[PDB]
Design a protein around this ligand. Structure first.
Ligand code: FMN
Ligand code: FMN
Ligand code: 0WV
Ligand code: 0WV
Ligand code: CL
Ligand code: CL
Ligand code: CL
Ligand code: CL
Ligand code: MG
Ligand code: MG
Ligand code: MG
Ligand code: MG
Ligand code: NA
Ligand code: NA
Ligand code: NA
Ligand code: NA
Ligand code: NA
Ligand code: NA
Ligand code: NA
Ligand code: NA
Ligand code: NA
Ligand code: NA
Lengths: 399, 399
């Protein structure tokens, strides 16, 4: 069915429908698919779904010139810990990714691989089964009681990374980025948001380190910036973006309750702009809005009203993708895209509307999403959401 | 004469004319007199002007319930270096300040002493004459060539403060604050703006130190925050505000060209909010806007468009005074004061309009200022600017 109470607005008369170049890619509009984990990858080996993933991405690439950021993809076994999320370290994975990237390109769209590392959000028992550590910035603060208890039961207590282990992750980011580009991706997004490993280093709640990787703004940002620099060196700044969620609380991040949080993220933005002014400007910065501090709460819930991401624009002068509860709020998008370097990521409603871009241009009803199939080993709720035309044929204009 | 091309707007229907409490003071409107050095203090001894200063402040206190921040006042001889700016360290100075504070209070207005320390902006020859150092954060970067050369000619090369000398300044801030309160002031403003000593520590251009007072965001902010904490302890948070100019370039500060500048100031704001949440909220934060990066350039010049101070509001949750080119821009004020904790400082046009507040409420023409008498040892251009009524009697409605 269509979302019942929604009053759509046609956005074709806004900058959402003006072309923009991101990295090497000439986008034809500014509605971006943000990274969306869907848990269709198969075990063993974290293999992108051999039956459905091509079709899923093909559907969502249908509007020419769309920027797609993939679901988070683990850079190595040690970076993972969910059996049904894909990786980008093995030949068998890249065989499937190549098919996905080809299909998106055949639709005249673009694809950026999000490089993911879980840290304390991983399942310690899966990691123990596979002979892997349970990693984070620190060893004396935990995501929650259940995770801490699972780690102890698995004889896999949370481990504070050594400097050498940080260097090994960086080597894996580099190789994962190389693999992604070689398989045909247009670029990569470094996931430093949503309370995963890099964010665990950025945040003073999760990072109690007293070495050069914690204990100050510069030190907490060090790992993220080392990954940035390593990937810029390996594959070029034009093929690299960075995702941040300054006000996020998901995965036990601090959000606005931490009075130093804006300074922490302003420092990162400044360091990116410094690199840009020195000739190495990242393709984009992707921000999760305080509109959505936890993406598993219904739209309108978990909204933080005490802060804005606008500060980033005073600092970083390149493209900015903003995501969080924009599908239901065309009135907000209309204002945000008056800024000529702003793109809008649409997450949950791209799950349910493969033709979302047409719907945004034309002010059409939106298909309701089914949260129960966000993570599910099924084609259902993955590749069977209808286009607007198909929904009309199903009678949804009368459901 | 009145400013020729100005189209006034009545602001009486805005929050500029709603009461607000700042520290202990019940303001009746939100038009603030920011600190304005006028150079009428007499030498020797940096004595507030015995002939005219009472009248100057009395005139500008005339609208009941006005917050006045004094001209910068040196906390000690070593903090000074301009012969005609006043101090707040001696009995002879405080005799005159007491008369000024009494007069402002008789007009049912309020007065906050700005505590000033010059650092590298001081004249090294005046300091040498008086047996004093020429101080800054560092000893290897200078305000400009002329200052460096004057220092060398005076056998008074710029001196990087030792930790003990920083502690001695802090002792002087404390005593100056105590003196101010004992003489009747309502509070003090710590001057950490406009490229004076504390700002020389905040800014990475002027602060090349490698000890705990430089080399990182936290370290560069240390002196400012130590002064904050010392004054909060001595006289109470309700009697202390802080002035900052994130985007200022006056006195060779970095402004927006420094990509880390927003992070530097966001850190300070965060540390203030941390103290506030722990029970010690400063009375206000006073920001100079990027509208005016140098207050000795005509309105509209030196405007930085690449940054906003709005980030501060995501961090600090108390009152904010904003200053910079607002008199000529009632349309901008009308928007800014929709925020219910925003006050507006009017500097240059308070020099020329003793009854500025009435003029703002009622949308009246503004007296043109005479920059030549901003700094002058004269009553002329100090206490002889007319009220609106007096200007009409002089025929200015036809000049
Ligand atoms: C099912 C689901 C999976 C997600 N997976 C990821 C992910 O892999 N990487 C990521 O950075 N964000 C992920 N997110 C967050 C989204 O990219 C997005 O920031 C968030 O859903 C808010 O945007 P929206 O309101 O348009 O959905 C996910 C969100 C959902 C609901
Ligand atoms: C003559 C003059 C003297 C000033 N003296 C001081 C001072 O003592 N302390 C201070 O913090 N700012 C000082 N300022 C800066 C003003 O407080 C204010 O921030 C600036 O003039 C911008 O506001 P305006 O456009 O309303 O004048 C001075 C400005 C002028 C023009
Ligand atoms: C990479 C993974 C598995 C993932 C899952 C959910 C979210 C919100 C996310 O940011 C990342
Ligand atoms: C305290 C002094 C003498 C002073 C003079 C000018 C400006 C802009 C200022 O901030 C301070
Ligand atoms: Cl619905
Ligand atoms: Cl799992
Ligand atoms: Cl004029
Ligand atoms: Cl002088
Ligand atoms: Mg241990
Ligand atoms: Mg169902
Ligand atoms: Mg020396
Ligand atoms: Mg003259
Ligand atoms: Na419409
Ligand atoms: Na199938
Ligand atoms: Na802005
Ligand atoms: Na789950
Ligand atoms: Na269905
Ligand atoms: Na009017
Ligand atoms: Na006289
Ligand atoms: Na705001
Ligand atoms: Na002068
Ligand atoms: Na005159």
């Amino acid at each position: 069915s269509f979302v019942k109470d929604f009053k759509p607005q046609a956005l074709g008369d806004t900058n959402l429908f003006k072309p923009i170049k991101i990295g090497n890619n000439e986008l034809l509009h500014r509605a971006v698919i943000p990274p969306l984990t869907r848990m269709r990858a198969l075990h063993p080996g974290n293999i992108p779904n051999r039956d459905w993933a091509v079709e899923y991405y093909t559907q969502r690439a249908q509007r020419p010139g769309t920027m797609i950021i993939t679901e988070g993809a683990f850079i190595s076994p040690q970076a993972g810990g969910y059996d049904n999320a894909p990786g980008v370290w093995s030949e068998e994975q890249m065989v499937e990714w190549t098919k996905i990237f080809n299909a998106i390109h055949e639709k005249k769209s673009f694809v950026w691989v999000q490089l993911a590392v879980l840290g304390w959000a991983a399942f310690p028992d899966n990691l123990a089964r596979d002979g892997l550590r349970y990693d984070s910035a620190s060893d004396n603060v935990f995501m929650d009681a259940e995770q801490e208890a699972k780690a102890k039961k698995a004889n896999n207590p949370q481990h504070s990374l050594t400097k050498d282990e940080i260097k090994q992750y960086i080597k894996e980011y580099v190789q994962a980025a190389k693999n992604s580009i070689a398989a045909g991706a247009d670029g990569v997004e470094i996931h430093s948001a949503n309370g995963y490993l890099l964010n665990q280093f950025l945040d003073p709640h999760s990072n109690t380190r007293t070495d050069e990787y914690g204990g100050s703004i510069e030190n907490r940002a060090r790992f993220t910036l080392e990954v940035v620099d390593a990937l810029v060196e390996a594959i070029g700044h034009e093929k690299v973006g960075l995702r941040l969620s300054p006000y996020g609380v998901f995965n036990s991040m601090s959000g606005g309750a931490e009075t130093g949080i804006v300074a922490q993220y302003a420092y990162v933005a400044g360091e990116l702009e410094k690199r840009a002014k020195a000739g190495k400007r990242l393709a984009f910065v992707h921000l999760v809005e305080p509109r959505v501090t936890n993406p598993f709460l219904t739209e309108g819930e978990g909204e933080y009203e005490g802060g804005s991401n606008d500060f980033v624009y005073s600092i970083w002068k390149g493209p900015v993708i903003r995501a969080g509860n924009f599908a239901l709020h065309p009135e907000v998008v209309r204002e945000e895209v008056k800024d000529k370097r702003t793109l809008i990521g649409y997450g949950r409603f791209f799950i349910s509307n493969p033709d979302l871009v047409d719907r945004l241009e034309k002010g059409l009803p939106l298909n309701k999403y089914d949260r129960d199939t966000f993570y599910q080993m099924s084609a259902h709720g993955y590749i069977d959401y209808p286009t607007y035309e198909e929904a009309l044929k199903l009678g949804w204009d009368k459901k």
